[PDB]
Amino acid sequence: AAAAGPQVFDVGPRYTNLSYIGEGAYGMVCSAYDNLNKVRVAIKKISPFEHQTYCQRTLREIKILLRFRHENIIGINDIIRAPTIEQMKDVYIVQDLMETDLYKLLKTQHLSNDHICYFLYQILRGLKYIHSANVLHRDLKPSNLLLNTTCDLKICDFGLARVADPDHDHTGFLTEYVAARWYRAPEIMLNSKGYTKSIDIWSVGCILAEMLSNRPIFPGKHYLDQLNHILGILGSPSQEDLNCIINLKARNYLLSLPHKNKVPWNRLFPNADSKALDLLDKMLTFNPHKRIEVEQALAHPYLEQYYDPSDEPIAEAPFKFDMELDDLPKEKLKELIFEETARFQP
Ligand SMILES: Nc1ncnc2c1ncn2[C@@H]1O[C@H](COP(=O)(O)OP(=O)(O)NP(=O)(O)O)[C@@H](O)[C@H]1O
User: Fold this and answer.
1) Ligand 1 atom, smallest distance to 27 CA
2) Which residues are registered as beta bridge partners of 153?
3) CA nearest neighbour of 139 among 121, 154, 124, 158
4) Class of the 100-311 domain?
5) How far, in Å, are 24, 91, 170, 175, 192 from residue 29 at the CA level?
6) How far does the centroid of ligand 1 lie from the alpha carbon of residue 19, in Å?
7) Rounded Cα–Cα distance for residues 194 and 187 (Å)
8) For the Protein kinase domain, which residue ranges apply?
9) C-alpha 130 to ligand 1 mean position (Å)
10) Which of the following is catalytic: 34, 139, 157, 200?
11) Cα angle: 315, vertex 160, 9; to 5 degrees
12) Residue 132 burial (C-beta neighbours within 10 Å; 0-12, 13-18, 19+)
């Protein structure tokens, strides 16, 4: 069994010349030579079968990634697992080798306006497909956007993705939530379970702002300090936007806050393309119902060098019902993963 930072990384003979490229909360990621396609590739060792939570996110991500075929969404090339449920402890996901991600890029590289444009175009082109599948990503952030040496951008990490369910979105004030704090839409803290498409556009808008300045625009240290950062810049919600918040705890919190005027994007980003700041504004709308949708973003003048709706495909087979996973035992979930991975077995 090949070892890597000697654990087991048993991608047997087909995949060789392993090297560490990070880890996580499910397993470890490696580069590796594919002795069949003569090309380096990424491999994610996932060991989730101990905890029902890990099995859900793994089942979720594999189902979605197998259903999705799109240039700007990471593909699965292969899955390595034991031929039997009893022998299967780990699963290995084989994926196109991507040389970096937007997080790693933003810490060290200044982006030209052409790069920011093209990156944002590819993010929304990928998100248009995702949203057309009635899926919500719900964890869009720079580390979840992978790049190769020719700046092709692929969206990954569908662990927290749900089927859109806007009828059942409403919830109380300060409702708990799992996805990256800095990219969380204001309604998440206020009255939203994160079950409508507009939560992804908010995250994309945060990513645009980050690409313009190499800093996260809303670096809140905790849950309510996230809301303080957003209104620190958008200013106080209008009566109209408050009118939409019917839940009295959320409403009275927002009423309790001192008046703050809108801080206009040009003073935050004086070097930015004005068309970029215009699109940023529509993406970072306090009111989810007023927030630009993915197809309108793609049609924005900022993206006109790329905009081609004939070349921005939608999904053939959208998810038409929620994935009823929430309290299935981690034993049924291993079975479902076994079954979802069968097509890659010889
Ligand atoms: N296809 C890939 N090509 C190259 N590097 C990758 C690829 N997928 C992940 N990585 C890198 O491997 C490391 C592990 O991160 P990553 O796997 O993205 O996060 P995780 O917390 O393990 N789970 P997830 O976000 O769902 O993918 C990071 O440095 C990633 O950028």
Assistant:
1) 22
2) 147
3) 158
4) mainly alpha
5) 8, 12, 37, 33, 33
6) 13
7) 8
8) 15-303
9) 19
10) 139
11) 100
12) middle
Resolution (A): 2.2
Q: Hey, whose CA ends up nearest to atom 13 of ligand 1?
A: 22
Q: How many residues does the chain have?
A: 346
The structure tokens 């035992």 sit at 329
Ligand 1: residues with CB < 6 A are: 21-22, 24-25, 29, 42, 44, 74, 95-98, 101, 144, 146, 156-157, 159
Which residues are paired to 246 by β-bridges?
Answer: none
CATH 3.30.30.10 assigned to 15-97+326-344: no
Residue 180 alpha carbon to ligand 1 centre in Å: 15
Cα dist from 269 to 128, 137, 202, 214, 257, whole Å: 27, 28, 18, 11, 26
